[PDB]
């Protein structure tokens, strides 16, 4: 056994524990700076850079090569909200909420917020659209659980907003993503599968009421949904939890 | 020894200075603590014995 | 009362996915197995295909010999009686050779010689599997993060059975092959080395093991909370940051005062987990070789009243 | 007089909720104590885990 | 100092108590009704630990220990310097943890996400309450709870564990450990798989989730999927904590002897209990 | 070369100020060691 | 001193009363527990 | 003036007067309770 | 000190009063708790000893 | 300057009421300390 | 010296004042606790022995 | 950009610093008096 | 030496001062704590022994 | 007619699987011999040549 | 050379105030050391 | 019925494992320990 | 065709493999013969 | 036996040389370890006794 | 033909160079064994 | 050795120098610590024995 | 052994040189440590005994 | 062949320099062993 | 060769500066070892 | 499915026959 | 053709195995 101290009580076990503290501080610094590649530098409520930016500097930029000729992502880099934000600050001082000036679900602010993502479908490994309707997918079927096709769709106001026509599936991952819901007007809307409850004889949507399924953002192509449209649909539906429960 | 200034064309000056500043402080603290832990060089205890304080 | 995304509501099955052929020898890859509906309520239903190359055969055969060697010794301890085999299944053990033999290989098969033979097979199986982990990522063009995270777990495994017994000078310092027996080795190790609770690297190892459960509960619950925005698709959130990544970040920023990104959270994840065995390996290696009484060592370093 | 009812109602609403949470804990603590008495505890006591 | 994308999410509402009285931020931190409560309980708890240090007579953070009242006091109150400060800190800790979970609920409602995170934190709170509140009340004394010290609360773990022999033989303990070890394995695999896809070999395109499925099907023959792994990670962490609280709530209250003796029920099964040979026969 | 984007003019001026700090740090340390060695030599 | 009423132009009166009711009840419970713990003032015993 | 909640100057005077009337009454009941406990068992 | 009123043009009164109320209750509870911990100023047990209530 | 939207008159008005509350709180504390000091002086 | 006011052109007054408020209170509590920790300066114990209140 | 990170102008920083230093001198003056009373009561030197 | 001002063209002044302030206070606390550890320089115990306060 | 085993089985797999088996078997046998004192050639030579 | 966007005359202005605060801090620390050394020398 | 590639590999490992088991069984029995019988 | 090899490639692989097998067999027989002379096990 | 080269067309040489390098080094280290374990072939212990060093 | 995209002549050269290294490694090992066996035979 | 300069075509100087500096400092610290552990070469203990400081 | 240069037409010079550097250093440290462990070859203790420094 | 990008000429230049370093590393290690064996032989 | 982008003149220049540092470091270490071996030799 | 029958029959016959001799081996 | 070459190994395995059991039977019979 070594057990011998170089000085004081500083033995080999003391060297190891202090060495780890230095490594741990270096590791934490690395982890924190690697996690500052999105949303930095900090801003004020007006959009100008904040005076305070924190003890950790921004990391050196890294480049991502997108898998299907979709370009290159450099982070941290220039950042901007391309859409306008329909909010008005409730106070001159920082740290207070910004009230919606209109209909937040329509505007897309607060819990209804959406990100101006790339207006292209997510592609699988082979280059095809990752999400497509089941009747357009070949060889796809409901394998287990209640088949939610033909079931009426009920909102949080206990009224029927339509019926389910199709299921949008994730082809590489083989999972139901969206439910295509036909309204009384005859148009179809998409509802994320995580925001519906597939009951025995109905599909219940807790987030939206009957007179809000019309406001769901539509898809520009009946057999294709883009990342921008998924974000708008998922944001709008989840915004109902706050703005559709009077 | 006259071309040593080219190291700043290789390494980020900010990262070198931060790494060096941390290194020099921790090295200095380590040596001071080593001297404090040796009774022959603990200047706080050497003066205590010299002036008969404890 | 709303859907919690803990189990799937509707299972959808299509043609069996054969996987990406980036640089993988497709002749070594088998066919797709059956679809398990039971697994489909929680994760994917598809079983297989599995790749079995050169390192797959080496790892499968070496580990099978290791498994069979322990089992045959267990049958020997049962007197070849199946009733006794099941009755004392957790009580059988393949002990390492006695300390009188030190590191020598001149130990009888009944008295630790079989432990060395079984340990050799385990050594080949684990390291062959590590190369299999490295080569599977290489054939798909992926990073080697999986192999290096595996190397941290191998480091603790190597210290327990190989590195520390060499440093301690006898195979008797190693872990026996038994269910209840290696739990007695774990308990005896702490008592022999004076309350391993006061090993600083054992305490750090527990801090990261606790933090692994904390971080996976945080990250798992965060992704399920934003999966209504597609948060489960983490790769496309890294390349094209959606509203799922922003809500996930803002929850923790408003809670903790700081947050992660969709990619950086997995750097926190991999490091929180590998530090369990990296720090754990150091602490075990320091026991007996540097410190033999961790509580006495604790008392001389704070950590315990005088 | 109506406004005085309003002020009292809001404070009572705040105090009534604090009572339900506090008394809910007592019902929980009271439950574990009853369960403890019906178990072989007090017939198999344990030593003090702390040095105190 | 907001994030670049943060401003559009700072809207009023989502609170459970009040609604605008405390519905504001202090820097990054959201303040609510429970944000005020969490800060008070936390700040009071820290200062009472600091005050307990001066009564103990130490300033080494590794020696500071707040002990629960001795067994003589039962479930009643104790003097502050004896065991009373532990009780108040426990109440402060309980209030701080519960207020922290409720504060997350309001943050969840404001951002329109699911309530998984406060629910998962409640599992940690109930494990804490099992050791300081439920088990001590069942055993009839506050002195069966662990002290508030960095290394003295490990002495409680050791002393409690060795009261029942080798605590490894607790069957719920074995189940909880398996979940803990598997969770750390799953976290390492999940972190590595995502990073290796996002960070390919060199100068290559970022890998698709199809490659993630392919890697683990090629390795072990099965891939649970992007949604499955996050469900699994959440379940493994909560199941480990659930069985941890279960292994302690039955210890000292239902089981009283050495936990090795429990496993004698398997060996003493009639059809093989009296066969010579082996370990136990 | 040029991984940091410094010209040769900027590199040698930065190194000039850095070396001035190094010698000033060393000069204090040389005097500090001299004072300690007179006070209590370690050889 | 005579302008303390302006606090109701800073904080919502309906939100203060509910929160004030919570504070006063928790204060009373805390003092009762402290008093119920001292043998000289425990009225249950 | 500042008006962070929509109450006017006259509405704040009215509500405060109601708030103080119950504040003094609540104080008075607490004084009697303290006197009752003090008579039964003084703490000074 | 004739223009300390300008602190209110730096800090919004709503967040200041909340912070001050938390701080004042925290400080007051801390001092009462400290005095109860000390046997020389625990007024509850001074009274019990004073009136021979034991 | 001008971080909260209050003008000078509003700042002076609010700070006058705040100080009036502060002195009232201090005055009761001074009486409370005086009563305790007579009962049991700590100096 | 006379240009120290320019620190406010670098640091935000709102964040410094909160930081200074937290720092000053924690420092003051820390020193009061240190004095209470030393028996020779615990003014609660000093008055106890002075007036024979043990 | 040392011409200002906080948006405060030069004369705004002068006025804020003047009030801040007054608060610092008032705080120090009380601290000096409090230290004098303690030193008279129980010196530490 | 005459060009040491050019460090502010390298390092952000906002982070330097915060890092320096944290470093200076922690260094001062460390040295004050070290002197309290030594009985020969614990000025709270030196005065107690000098004035017979034990 | 054993040459047909290559028409069915992949030559990469059989050579490795046989090579893996042969090496593991050889190490196992050498270790069993070292286990038995009658065939530990390192101990046999020590006694024969009067060594340590 | 610049990484922070400060001009040369802004760096000189910032440094001049910084060094003034450094010398003032060092002036107090020297007086503090001299007083402690007179009270209780450590050499 | 049976896949020619699957059968032989599974059969082969079975034959090898059974060979070791019987060889090790005699190794365990003191009456069939040729390494010790020859001693 | 489970391997893509015909007789033209099955016969060649077997011819080399058997030659490698004989060489390994020949050395092992020589190794066993030397051991038996040094220390017979029967 | 003069046609062994065709095995290279079967197995990728890059993996083979790595496989051989790891295999050869482990075998050499293992055998050296076995010799050190045996006291009759521990050349460090043998020379210690022969030259009377311990 | 080949499973690794290597021609016969590409395999002809790789084996011949690999074999020359093998005999070089074996020749050194034979000399090493002879030195050990003379110093301390194991048979 | 006339063509050793071509190592920098293969390896990034930024990567080598950081690794070399970490390796050089860790090695030097370890050797200094090894000599301090051995009383024969602990230059702090040797000075104390020589100058009768213990 | 004049065609051994072809090893670089199979393997990356970057990886082999790193793998050789890690291997060479780990081997030398292990051997230096094995000798330090054996008392017959501990050159620090041998020197202490030869000059009688204990 | 051509698994990295080196030609026949570049590999010849690389291997010549690699062997030059290898012989120098070996030549120093031989003198190191010679000095140790003369100082304290292990045979 | 393009692994690092050095054009055989930046590599000759960088090696020249690197070796200058290596010899300066080795020269200092030699004097350190010589001084210690004179102080108390380790053979 | 004749394949699954052989696997189920083959495993049951082999494991029982191994077990039967092991039971004989035990005594 | 699978059966034809398989049974060739069976006799190769069994006849050698018969020699194996016969040799041990003479060396140490188990009946
Ligand atoms: C893999 C290894 C993992 C090891 C984990 C150990 C603990 C690590 C904690 C997280 C890292 C530090 C905190 C995050 C960074 C940070 O300071 O963020 C700031 C807020 O911090 C905060 O609000 C920090 C709150 C306190 C965190 C815990 C610190 C103490 C832990 C030890 C226990 C102490 C008990 C009490 C004494 C805001 O800045 P930013 O990050 O947004 O951006 C900075 C650049 N602009
Ligand atoms: C256990 O082992 C013990 C501790 C006992 C013994 C071991 C000791 C060891 C391992 C010691 C190691 C010591 C070493 C390696 C020390 C190295 C020290 C160095 C390199 C110090 C260098 C200091 C350099 C300084 C302080 C330079 C400062 C420069 C400035 C202040 C100027 C700032 C530069 C500016 C402003 C450039 C601006 C110019 C432009 C054009 C922008
Ligand atoms: C372990 O070691 C121990 C603890 C024992 C000993 C160590 C002790 C140490 C290290 C102590 C360190 C102490 C230090 C560094 C203390 C520093 C104290 C300072 C800097 C105090 C400054 C206080 C300044 C105050 C209170 C200023 C207040 C200002 C106001 C109240 C005015 C309000 C400002 C306005 C209105 C701004 C103007 C606004 C407009 C719109 C013009
Ligand atoms: C935080 C990690 C990085 C820090 C910077 C690098 C520092 C490297 C050296 C750190 C180790 C020295 O730290 C110092 O070690 C000595 C060695 O006995 C300890 O020793 C001191 O306390 C112990 C325990 O009470 C006493 O037995 C001993 O007589 C006394 O000198 C000190 O408690 C510790 O403060
Ligand atoms: C202690 C926690 C106090 C909770 C108070 C809840 C008040 C609820 C008021 N309301 C209108 C929602 O019923
Ligand atoms: C079944 C496993 C048996 C292992 C023991 C074989 C014989 C051991 N020994 C020492 C007699 O040779
Ligand atoms: Fe994830």
mmCIF file of N, CA and C in Angstrom, chain C residues 230-302:
data_model
loop_
_atom_site.group_PDB
_atom_site.id
_atom_site.type_symbol
_atom_site.label_atom_id
_atom_site.label_comp_id
_atom_site.label_asym_id
_atom_site.label_seq_id
_atom_site.Cartn_x
_atom_site.Cartn_y
_atom_site.Cartn_z
ATOM 1 N N UNK C 230 -43.805 17.492 -31.159
ATOM 2 C CA UNK C 230 -42.777 16.751 -31.858
ATOM 3 C C UNK C 230 -41.442 16.704 -31.157
ATOM 4 N N UNK C 231 -41.419 16.896 -29.836
ATOM 5 C CA UNK C 231 -40.169 16.924 -29.098
ATOM 6 C C UNK C 231 -39.413 15.611 -29.093
ATOM 7 N N UNK C 232 -40.112 14.486 -29.265
ATOM 8 C CA UNK C 232 -39.442 13.192 -29.330
ATOM 9 C C UNK C 232 -38.504 13.087 -30.523
ATOM 10 N N UNK C 233 -38.743 13.867 -31.575
ATOM 11 C CA UNK C 233 -37.870 13.896 -32.747
ATOM 12 C C UNK C 233 -36.718 14.864 -32.477
ATOM 13 N N UNK C 234 -35.796 14.406 -31.630
ATOM 14 C CA UNK C 234 -34.745 15.278 -31.125
ATOM 15 C C UNK C 234 -33.741 15.660 -32.207
ATOM 16 N N UNK C 235 -33.507 14.782 -33.184
ATOM 17 C CA UNK C 235 -32.520 15.083 -34.217
ATOM 18 C C UNK C 235 -32.963 16.244 -35.100
ATOM 19 N N UNK C 236 -34.246 16.298 -35.462
ATOM 20 C CA UNK C 236 -34.726 17.414 -36.268
ATOM 21 C C UNK C 236 -34.954 18.675 -35.444
ATOM 22 N N UNK C 237 -35.042 18.555 -34.118
ATOM 23 C CA UNK C 237 -35.055 19.737 -33.264
ATOM 24 C C UNK C 237 -33.668 20.350 -33.143
ATOM 25 N N UNK C 238 -32.622 19.531 -33.250
ATOM 26 C CA UNK C 238 -31.260 20.051 -33.268
ATOM 27 C C UNK C 238 -30.983 20.782 -34.576
ATOM 28 N N UNK C 239 -31.385 20.191 -35.703
ATOM 29 C CA UNK C 239 -31.100 20.786 -37.005
ATOM 30 C C UNK C 239 -32.021 21.961 -37.312
ATOM 31 N N UNK C 240 -33.286 21.883 -36.894
ATOM 32 C CA UNK C 240 -34.265 22.947 -37.136
ATOM 33 C C UNK C 240 -35.065 23.126 -35.848
ATOM 34 N N UNK C 241 -34.600 24.036 -34.996
ATOM 35 C CA UNK C 241 -35.185 24.243 -33.677
ATOM 36 C C UNK C 241 -36.648 24.651 -33.769
ATOM 37 N N UNK C 242 -37.541 23.794 -33.275
ATOM 38 C CA UNK C 242 -38.958 24.073 -33.261
ATOM 39 C C UNK C 242 -39.421 24.634 -31.930
ATOM 40 N N UNK C 243 -40.743 24.728 -31.790
ATOM 41 C CA UNK C 243 -41.315 25.259 -30.561
ATOM 42 C C UNK C 243 -41.200 24.279 -29.400
ATOM 43 N N UNK C 244 -41.007 22.988 -29.684
ATOM 44 C CA UNK C 244 -40.795 22.019 -28.614
ATOM 45 C C UNK C 244 -39.495 22.296 -27.874
ATOM 46 N N UNK C 245 -38.429 22.608 -28.614
ATOM 47 C CA UNK C 245 -37.143 22.878 -27.987
ATOM 48 C C UNK C 245 -37.161 24.181 -27.201
ATOM 49 N N UNK C 246 -37.929 25.171 -27.658
ATOM 50 C CA UNK C 246 -37.967 26.451 -26.962
ATOM 51 C C UNK C 246 -38.758 26.359 -25.665
ATOM 52 N N UNK C 247 -39.889 25.653 -25.683
ATOM 53 C CA UNK C 247 -40.660 25.464 -24.460
ATOM 54 C C UNK C 247 -39.894 24.622 -23.452
ATOM 55 N N UNK C 248 -39.204 23.583 -23.924
ATOM 56 C CA UNK C 248 -38.391 22.765 -23.032
ATOM 57 C C UNK C 248 -37.284 23.590 -22.389
ATOM 58 N N UNK C 249 -36.640 24.459 -23.169
ATOM 59 C CA UNK C 249 -35.601 25.324 -22.623
ATOM 60 C C UNK C 249 -36.176 26.347 -21.654
ATOM 61 N N UNK C 250 -37.335 26.922 -21.982
ATOM 62 C CA UNK C 250 -37.874 27.997 -21.159
ATOM 63 C C UNK C 250 -38.449 27.483 -19.848
ATOM 64 N N UNK C 251 -38.932 26.241 -19.816
ATOM 65 C CA UNK C 251 -39.388 25.677 -18.552
ATOM 66 C C UNK C 251 -38.257 25.646 -17.537
ATOM 67 N N UNK C 252 -37.097 25.132 -17.943
ATOM 68 C CA UNK C 252 -35.981 24.985 -17.022
ATOM 69 C C UNK C 252 -35.278 26.306 -16.755
ATOM 70 N N UNK C 253 -35.236 27.204 -17.739
ATOM 71 C CA UNK C 253 -34.703 28.535 -17.484
ATOM 72 C C UNK C 253 -35.553 29.277 -16.465
ATOM 73 N N UNK C 254 -36.877 29.160 -16.571
ATOM 74 C CA UNK C 254 -37.745 29.813 -15.601
ATOM 75 C C UNK C 254 -37.718 29.099 -14.257
ATOM 76 N N UNK C 255 -37.407 27.804 -14.249
ATOM 77 C CA UNK C 255 -37.296 27.058 -13.001
ATOM 78 C C UNK C 255 -35.913 27.219 -12.371
ATOM 79 N N UNK C 256 -34.870 26.769 -13.072
ATOM 80 C CA UNK C 256 -33.523 26.716 -12.516
ATOM 81 C C UNK C 256 -32.715 27.985 -12.733
ATOM 82 N N UNK C 257 -33.138 28.866 -13.629
ATOM 83 C CA UNK C 257 -32.315 29.987 -14.021
ATOM 84 C C UNK C 257 -31.347 29.692 -15.142
ATOM 85 N N UNK C 258 -31.291 28.451 -15.614
ATOM 86 C CA UNK C 258 -30.448 28.080 -16.738
ATOM 87 C C UNK C 258 -31.065 26.861 -17.400
ATOM 88 N N UNK C 259 -30.646 26.599 -18.632
ATOM 89 C CA UNK C 259 -31.265 25.551 -19.425
ATOM 90 C C UNK C 259 -30.210 24.884 -20.292
ATOM 91 N N UNK C 260 -30.649 23.885 -21.039
ATOM 92 C CA UNK C 260 -29.840 23.167 -22.004
ATOM 93 C C UNK C 260 -30.412 23.392 -23.401
ATOM 94 N N UNK C 261 -29.757 22.808 -24.393
ATOM 95 C CA UNK C 261 -30.281 22.748 -25.748
ATOM 96 C C UNK C 261 -30.687 21.316 -26.061
ATOM 97 N N UNK C 262 -31.289 21.131 -27.235
ATOM 98 C CA UNK C 262 -31.722 19.796 -27.624
ATOM 99 C C UNK C 262 -30.540 18.857 -27.817
ATOM 100 N N UNK C 263 -29.384 19.386 -28.214
ATOM 101 C CA UNK C 263 -28.195 18.559 -28.361
ATOM 102 C C UNK C 263 -27.345 18.536 -27.099
ATOM 103 N N UNK C 264 -27.209 19.677 -26.424
ATOM 104 C CA UNK C 264 -26.349 19.748 -25.260
ATOM 105 C C UNK C 264 -26.873 19.004 -24.053
ATOM 106 N N UNK C 265 -28.189 18.798 -23.970
ATOM 107 C CA UNK C 265 -28.743 18.012 -22.872
ATOM 108 C C UNK C 265 -28.212 16.588 -22.915
ATOM 109 N N UNK C 266 -27.933 16.071 -24.111
ATOM 110 C CA UNK C 266 -27.373 14.736 -24.245
ATOM 111 C C UNK C 266 -25.879 14.697 -23.958
ATOM 112 N N UNK C 267 -25.207 15.849 -23.955
ATOM 113 C CA UNK C 267 -23.851 15.909 -23.421
ATOM 114 C C UNK C 267 -23.863 15.870 -21.898
ATOM 115 N N UNK C 268 -24.807 16.576 -21.276
ATOM 116 C CA UNK C 268 -25.046 16.393 -19.849
ATOM 117 C C UNK C 268 -25.395 14.944 -19.544
ATOM 118 N N UNK C 269 -26.184 14.317 -20.418
ATOM 119 C CA UNK C 269 -26.654 12.959 -20.176
ATOM 120 C C UNK C 269 -25.508 11.957 -20.210
ATOM 121 N N UNK C 270 -24.692 11.995 -21.264
ATOM 122 C CA UNK C 270 -23.644 10.992 -21.408
ATOM 123 C C UNK C 270 -22.583 11.165 -20.326
ATOM 124 N N UNK C 271 -22.288 12.407 -19.941
ATOM 125 C CA UNK C 271 -21.264 12.633 -18.928
ATOM 126 C C UNK C 271 -21.756 12.285 -17.531
ATOM 127 N N UNK C 272 -23.015 12.595 -17.219
ATOM 128 C CA UNK C 272 -23.562 12.225 -15.919
ATOM 129 C C UNK C 272 -23.494 10.718 -15.706
ATOM 130 N N UNK C 273 -23.659 9.941 -16.778
ATOM 131 C CA UNK C 273 -23.676 8.490 -16.652
ATOM 132 C C UNK C 273 -22.271 7.895 -16.640
ATOM 133 N N UNK C 274 -21.376 8.364 -17.513
ATOM 134 C CA UNK C 274 -20.039 7.780 -17.552
ATOM 135 C C UNK C 274 -19.227 8.156 -16.321
ATOM 136 N N UNK C 275 -19.531 9.287 -15.685
ATOM 137 C CA UNK C 275 -18.839 9.652 -14.458
ATOM 138 C C UNK C 275 -19.166 8.710 -13.310
ATOM 139 N N UNK C 276 -20.249 7.938 -13.416
ATOM 140 C CA UNK C 276 -20.571 6.959 -12.383
ATOM 141 C C UNK C 276 -19.474 5.905 -12.291
ATOM 142 N N UNK C 277 -19.100 5.328 -13.429
ATOM 143 C CA UNK C 277 -18.107 4.263 -13.455
ATOM 144 C C UNK C 277 -16.680 4.783 -13.550
ATOM 145 N N UNK C 278 -16.474 5.944 -14.172
ATOM 146 C CA UNK C 278 -15.140 6.533 -14.203
ATOM 147 C C UNK C 278 -14.681 6.902 -12.799
ATOM 148 N N UNK C 279 -15.507 7.657 -12.074
ATOM 149 C CA UNK C 279 -15.194 7.986 -10.689
ATOM 150 C C UNK C 279 -15.237 6.743 -9.807
ATOM 151 N N UNK C 280 -16.187 5.844 -10.067
ATOM 152 C CA UNK C 280 -16.269 4.619 -9.290
ATOM 153 C C UNK C 280 -15.047 3.736 -9.445
ATOM 154 N N UNK C 281 -14.492 3.673 -10.656
ATOM 155 C CA UNK C 281 -13.292 2.882 -10.868
ATOM 156 C C UNK C 281 -12.094 3.415 -10.107
ATOM 157 N N UNK C 282 -11.946 4.741 -10.060
ATOM 158 C CA UNK C 282 -10.853 5.351 -9.307
ATOM 159 C C UNK C 282 -10.982 5.034 -7.823
ATOM 160 N N UNK C 283 -12.194 5.146 -7.277
ATOM 161 C CA UNK C 283 -12.382 4.912 -5.854
ATOM 162 C C UNK C 283 -12.085 3.484 -5.441
ATOM 163 N N UNK C 284 -12.516 2.517 -6.250
ATOM 164 C CA UNK C 284 -12.195 1.122 -5.976
ATOM 165 C C UNK C 284 -10.697 0.884 -6.104
ATOM 166 N N UNK C 285 -10.070 1.475 -7.122
ATOM 167 C CA UNK C 285 -8.636 1.297 -7.315
ATOM 168 C C UNK C 285 -7.832 1.872 -6.155
ATOM 169 N N UNK C 286 -8.331 2.929 -5.517
ATOM 170 C CA UNK C 286 -7.643 3.525 -4.379
ATOM 171 C C UNK C 286 -7.848 2.752 -3.083
ATOM 172 N N UNK C 287 -8.769 1.795 -3.053
ATOM 173 C CA UNK C 287 -9.052 1.029 -1.847
ATOM 174 C C UNK C 287 -8.108 -0.163 -1.760
ATOM 175 N N UNK C 288 -7.412 -0.280 -0.632
ATOM 176 C CA UNK C 288 -6.431 -1.315 -0.427
ATOM 177 C C UNK C 288 -5.058 -0.991 -0.980
ATOM 178 N N UNK C 289 -4.995 -0.276 -2.101
ATOM 179 C CA UNK C 289 -3.726 0.108 -2.705
ATOM 180 C C UNK C 289 -3.168 1.402 -2.132
ATOM 181 N N UNK C 290 -4.031 2.334 -1.731
ATOM 182 C CA UNK C 290 -3.621 3.609 -1.155
ATOM 183 C C UNK C 290 -4.223 3.811 0.231
ATOM 184 N N UNK C 291 -5.515 3.531 0.377
ATOM 185 C CA UNK C 291 -6.234 3.711 1.631
ATOM 186 C C UNK C 291 -6.852 2.377 2.023
ATOM 187 N N UNK C 292 -6.618 1.958 3.266
ATOM 188 C CA UNK C 292 -7.209 0.737 3.792
ATOM 189 C C UNK C 292 -8.297 0.988 4.824
ATOM 190 N N UNK C 293 -8.424 2.214 5.327
ATOM 191 C CA UNK C 293 -9.472 2.574 6.282
ATOM 192 C C UNK C 293 -10.009 3.933 5.847
ATOM 193 N N UNK C 294 -11.129 3.924 5.123
ATOM 194 C CA UNK C 294 -11.650 5.168 4.569
ATOM 195 C C UNK C 294 -12.244 6.066 5.643
ATOM 196 N N UNK C 295 -12.748 5.489 6.736
ATOM 197 C CA UNK C 295 -13.271 6.317 7.816
ATOM 198 C C UNK C 295 -12.149 7.040 8.548
ATOM 199 N N UNK C 296 -11.045 6.341 8.820
ATOM 200 C CA UNK C 296 -9.870 6.995 9.387
ATOM 201 C C UNK C 296 -9.318 8.022 8.411
ATOM 202 N N UNK C 297 -9.252 7.666 7.128
ATOM 203 C CA UNK C 297 -8.869 8.637 6.111
ATOM 204 C C UNK C 297 -9.827 9.818 6.105
ATOM 205 N N UNK C 298 -11.123 9.549 6.261
ATOM 206 C CA UNK C 298 -12.083 10.633 6.347
ATOM 207 C C UNK C 298 -11.791 11.568 7.502
ATOM 208 N N UNK C 299 -11.532 11.004 8.687
ATOM 209 C CA UNK C 299 -11.300 11.816 9.879
ATOM 210 C C UNK C 299 -10.110 12.750 9.715
ATOM 211 N N UNK C 300 -9.082 12.323 8.988
ATOM 212 C CA UNK C 300 -7.906 13.152 8.765
ATOM 213 C C UNK C 300 -8.106 14.166 7.649
ATOM 214 N N UNK C 301 -9.287 14.197 7.028
ATOM 215 C CA UNK C 301 -9.557 15.089 5.908
ATOM 216 C C UNK C 301 -10.849 15.877 6.099
ATOM 217 N N UNK C 302 -11.292 16.056 7.340
ATOM 218 C CA UNK C 302 -12.616 16.586 7.596
ATOM 219 C C UNK C 302 -13.613 15.448 7.652
#
